[PDB]
């Protein structure tokens, strides 16, 4: 039942002398161990995609493109099986674990085709002066080397695939390090490309503790590139570590939902529910605080309560929409911020309760900028709503947050929403719809403290690839 | 004739309570002084830039381009004015001191043109998934707030203008630091934007000692965007300091010239030449190592040789091909490079002389890559010649070079040359002709320790713009 | 009166016949233009066709160069060639003057917009393993000769908005003006020849179509007919063109769709500027509206108030509605209005016509059995036609055989963009009049509208080939 | 021999009249083809407007997915369907096969690069001040209702090219495959069906020219005409489009320029295999060398020696050089050997026919004054001219009518580019022979090669056309 899971390294599966066993946290059933890695055998990991680099970059990117296809239908096919303990893991659905699957092998299938059509430029010297009219640069596309994929615990099959595969199809080889809590779900995903017959080398993984390997992964002279889903001040910290090289972070968010005096509130109450509480609130892209008119706020305010009291509170296995959260510490953080909210006067529509890890969904009314809720990111079935008086302020509200990922804005009056987007502070503003990383063909960035870079699968390949121009005279 | 010169602060000329006086590096007449900001003033350049943004980004593309149009025009019209001082300043040419304001109003003009062009994305949600079929993204360009441009003593105007002009087309505001030999043709910059009648705040100079305020310039949470071209150690410090934040650097090369059995030899000379010894060799992308096969190498070194010999050696109000070093320290360097070539065998075919800091140009012979000269940037008229008997060797020596800026070869077969291009870790490979920054439409970048991110004028729009995409569901 | 000549390479020459024109508005003598002969067309291609090499290889630069000399010297002059241009097609005279300055950005821009010309490099390796080794160097190139054919009511604005691009690309250009606008077109070409534009790389052709119209097109030394006028007229050029590019800009009968929550103020302001801009003779224009029954009443009532503060006279007095192009015009917009009395439609506004001066006639309860729901006025005449739903509103506007741009006046966005994505239409304004501008944006029609797609950057995609230079990587 | 119906509306029809096929190597009956009325043509293009609205409707997720599901029915049935085309048109068996899966990887591609449809979005503050809040929100759409025209030489294939990059941007589509190769037209038409291509989006044509040619290209439903096959049935199609867009790969008579410092050993194998391809019947073959005088003894000793190796036969037995065509063709290609010999041209291998079994003939000392130097063969014939200077090559290679691709033989590659911006051509191929592939490249011809760029994402650019939605921002 419980396995030992083994790296992938250079072709080969290896265990480490030490290891670190993963326990369910909705159950604390054990699943599993994941090897405990040393700084040398992160070494021996980056010889070998170093090594591999030359081969796979000389490659077409039409044989590149078949081993991503390759590997995206041994997870389509295994979807059941790495969506069990996926679930398990990370005390997510059932359903939506293997959901994540197959939303992995989608990105997987949409960054092998979109990669494939690399194009490069033809430049004028006629363009900028007469003199070099017969020079030309011809500027192609080249991998940046080495891409450090560091995948975070909400998403360990789906936001490591958005990164290993877009790397992989511009010729560039990988080391992904799946989060602790997620490592048996990142290996399970390695297994697809190991058995899709990857070359040895081009594709690996890394698991250990942050103590003995966190700093050493990232610091290390062979990574060419960082791209990180994590918390904030972890990104703060790689983007320090890595000097000048090139990274991509996707770090906290604080999504507000700005309902305007002519929204269709059952609307935005379906759309700020569905994405407040979605996976208990652990999504960095999720509705976390309503910026609402106050004509209209006591309305929208009884009609987000109906919906969070039908939302299911249970395990995993039941697809309950409320889960028991990732560990001790991600529980009481969000019950310090429901007592500072209850302290300081916030009106409880929805009761808190809490059985180990698992929180009941709180909705919160009269919430003010006073209050830890209305700024902090919880990662847990909490939702503040923060009453306005103007667009002006709820603009300024929503701008004062240290995060800028997505907004939301509900209105019948688009003129006026895209004025209003322009002045947000934020990567993606979506107009009478929750707050969302997909379709993953669009672009997701944050503002701010909220990440570096642009993802979205052609925005990740241009990311991590590099150019190269030959310039010569026509005669 | 020595002016007391200030910095532009919100639309207001300041002088500070220390200053600076800068001395022209080729007979020490005194040129005027800088002044010597505190972090206090640093803080208030920063503080103007963040107040001017919002109205600055909100303007059209066109009234941006306006400005821009016409500081390009007050340039050429001051071009010897500015030339003049700027060829005293850091013991540049006369003619090409005046050249390089030409060139810098040249890219102003460039990058405002090809800014005011600037066009988003429509990207489709049925690309991905056919339950977002109705769900399109409307991806517009955004400009990603202060950038702090930092400019080179080599040159102080051109490669001031190459970060002022493309990001301020694009809605960011600037905050310009010349170097301290480079800053009375920094603040003369400055004073043709000023005059332009560029907003309060949206374009402003800082000038100081690295010592109060190197590296609070850099760390100040307003700077959004660092945009630098210096020193590779330094860079290094940036790409810290900047922590999360964009970047582009722009750092030291080693180009190797790469000749081959077939080369128009006497073509491969003056190429070599004049990219070698161009403004003393004191410039980043400039020919610092010929890489030729032995059977052509006796012809190709007594062909540089009466090259040398020919280049002039004075003062730059003369015109002289090879002008007096930036300082003492980099004279000295340049002459323990010298000596230790010398010293570990190899051939001295120009002789070495010095006076003051006008070091005569010095070419070797039979360099060997256990010389300091094979790999160290010496920024000065000194030029290795290393021998080699395949191109698998050549390619070896150039890529074991931690630069990676621009590579040259010289050959009449193409498609080797594309070949060997594809193997080279550079940004640029020129194929019969010195490599080179432009023309500045073309990709200018540096692979390994030649620094991060792309610059040429729309690549340097690109990368100091962000994106905000606002997606809606069509019904 | 002046009597004007034809820019034939770098040479101003006068035919053996001319044509002398006249003011629509007052029959002034305003000069005359030469009528050229089939030879003579033959010289001003043979002579484009030998300058063609020498300006296809100078620098972008270069051509960018000459382009901002020529739009200078508009802007110089545009007081003086305003002036004309006015009296001969009877447009206001600041309306003149503006047009020659908003040539003048279009020239501009389109010299900066093709200068910055990108190529392509593709991989084989895209395609299959075995190419991974070969490239192909895809590079912009000219089509050759355009024969350009500007339209009466734009005649330096819609004949520069085909020279600077065509020119841009390094090709050579035969400006072939109507002959009313043919001065105006001829004055347009000495700002060229004044920026020192090379002999053969731009000239001009006037005559008459009894003569010269079909040769012009049908000549086998033009590579590219790029043409604005009538649809008939265009139909006869995609024939003529053979398998040859084209670029057409043809009839509108633009509707404007307005939903029971528009703005009925701005609905009336818009559809009145619109419909009635040049009295009606623009191709771009409020044709048509097409009103939910609801807020008809109320909207034909806002409607009525702007069309009756419209003032009607001489070119010279700035008047909203001017004299009419010509009688023929005047005559044809008269049978308009008889149709439309004749079969129950209710005259908001009445008609009056002194000499070509017709009046803005503004209809209401129009059904589609009368003409004016379909045809093409070119006068000061508006249809209201009412709907009972939106499903009418679009099967009515689809049902023209014009398909150039529709307006949609509501205040339900997502709603306007299903509208939009079911109108058979190259365009489609959300609470605005339709439009060209702005000139950096497509402008293109579906149907009978036109053929390609215009607005700067898309006129010199249209006017320019591709060069591919294939070879193995060793 | 099995009798073969048209995918009409879902459905499999016959009509009244049929025409049987032929193998053209042998004579063997291979069935026969419905032999369509113009009321029949009628009912496919009711069928297909009407199916239009819901294919378009559709994701691109969606129409990509029948693309595929087709390719990988056409790999399946690769060796069946090649068995039958390779009878069909005379095309070795190998080789026949091949173009089933090269259609295949074509259908995969388009499918791919056109669900990655993008538009654009523009800034009205590019252009103007004052219009710095308006932008349009620019997106593709179908064309609607696009003909095929599918030639002989690669039924499949060149039926492939146009029907997936036009399905994919939501257009709708009638396939006319040739008479020679209705079958194999047919056979593909049966993959899209077994796919579940929905009724009227996939349509398949056959019949006669004089009783359909004409009309097929001339009818009002149809929006846009495909084409590949001759230049004077090219020429007619753009004349019976009119305005409509088209695109057309008509006639080669690609050149391929020697110059002295060229290794003649690898000019010599690329010219042999691109000349003698399928016995010459490509457009894209090497159909004329240019040599300079110096190195012209030794090339053309270096074809020959390869010329005289090609095996000439049967289809069945893969051989080089097969039965032509027809006997038309046959005759015809023998009358320009006669043209040469009469001439002077000097044969360096022997002519010899066997029915339609042209063996193949290679000529040198060839001038401009043999009909052979300029007229497309379709036929196992080559001509070598000799020049003295590249002056003169670029000269005799420019006079031609044709301007498909070129092929440039030398170790100077900065010259032979210089060469490639003078030659009038779409792709200039270095030290290879002239070719379409890979299928992602543009294909093109310049002068009366073509109208239009093909190349799977140029393909799809062509059929597919702009909407644009232009608001102000608040």
Avoid at 206 to 231: C, M
Avoid at 343 to 364: C, H, M, Q, W, Y
Wanted: proline share 4%; net charge negative; hydrophobic share 45%.
């Amino acid at each position: 039942m419980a396995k030992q899971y083994k790296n992938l390294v250079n072709g080969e599966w290896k265990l480490s002398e030490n290891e670190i066993t993963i326990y369910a946290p909705a159950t604390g059933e054990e699943l599993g161990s994941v090897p405990a890695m040393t700084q040398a055998e992160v070494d021996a990991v980056y010889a070998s995609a170093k090594k591999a680099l030359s081969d796979w970059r000389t490659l077409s990117y039409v044989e590149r493109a078949a081993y991503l296809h390759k590997a995206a239908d041994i997870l389509v096919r295994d979807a059941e099986k790495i969506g069990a303990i996926l679930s398990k893991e990370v005390a997510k659905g059932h359903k939506a674990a293997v959901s994540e699957v197959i939303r992995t092998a989608e990105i997987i299938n949409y960054a092998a085709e979109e990669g494939l059509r690399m194009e490069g430029e033809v430049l004028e010297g006629g363009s900028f002066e007469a003199a070099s009219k017969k020079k030309i640069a011809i500027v192609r596309r080249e991998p940046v080397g080495l891409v450090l994929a560091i995948s975070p615990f909400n998403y360990p099959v789906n936001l490591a695939g958005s990164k290993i595969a877009p790397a992989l199809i511009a010729g560039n080889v990988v080391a992904l390090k799946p989060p602790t809590q997620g490592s048996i779900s990142g290996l399970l995903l390695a297994e697809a490309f190991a058995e899709a017959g990857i070359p040895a080398g081009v594709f690996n993984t890394i698991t250990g503790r942050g103590s003995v390997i966190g700093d050493y992964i990232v610091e290390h002279e062979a990574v060419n590139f960082i791209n990180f889903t994590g918390s904030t001040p972890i990104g703060e910290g790689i983007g320090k570590l890595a000097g000048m090289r090139p990274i991509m972070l996707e770090l906290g968010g604080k999504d507000s939902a700005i309902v305007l005096e002519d929204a269709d509130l059952a609307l935005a109450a379906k759309n700020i529910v569905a994405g407040a509480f979605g996976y208990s609130g652990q999504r960095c892209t999720a509705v976390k605080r309503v910026l609402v008119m106050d004509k209209v706020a006591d309305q929208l305010a009884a009609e987000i309560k109906t919906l969070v009291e039908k939302l299911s509170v249970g395990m995993p296995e039941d697809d309950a929409d409320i889960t028991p959260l990732i560990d001790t510490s991600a529980a009481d953080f969000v019950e310090g911020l429901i007592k500072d909210a209850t302290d300081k006067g916030a009106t409880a529509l929805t009761a808190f309760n809490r059985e180990g890890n698992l929180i009941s969904p709180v909705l919160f009314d009269h919430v003010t900028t006073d209050m830890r809720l209305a700024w902090e990111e919880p990662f847990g079935p909490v939702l503040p709503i923060i009453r306005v008086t103007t667009v002006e302020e709820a603009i300024k509200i929503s701008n004062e947050s240290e995060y800028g990922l997505q907004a939301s804005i509900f209105t019948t009056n688009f003129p006026k929403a895209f004025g209003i987007a322009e002045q947000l502070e934020v990567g993606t503003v979506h107009l009478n719809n929750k707050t969302q990383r997909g379709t993953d063909n669009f672009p997701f960035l944050g503002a701010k403290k909220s990440g570096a870079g642009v993802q979205g699968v052609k925005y990740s390949i241009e990311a991590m690839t590099t150019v190269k121009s030959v310039v010569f005279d026509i005669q």
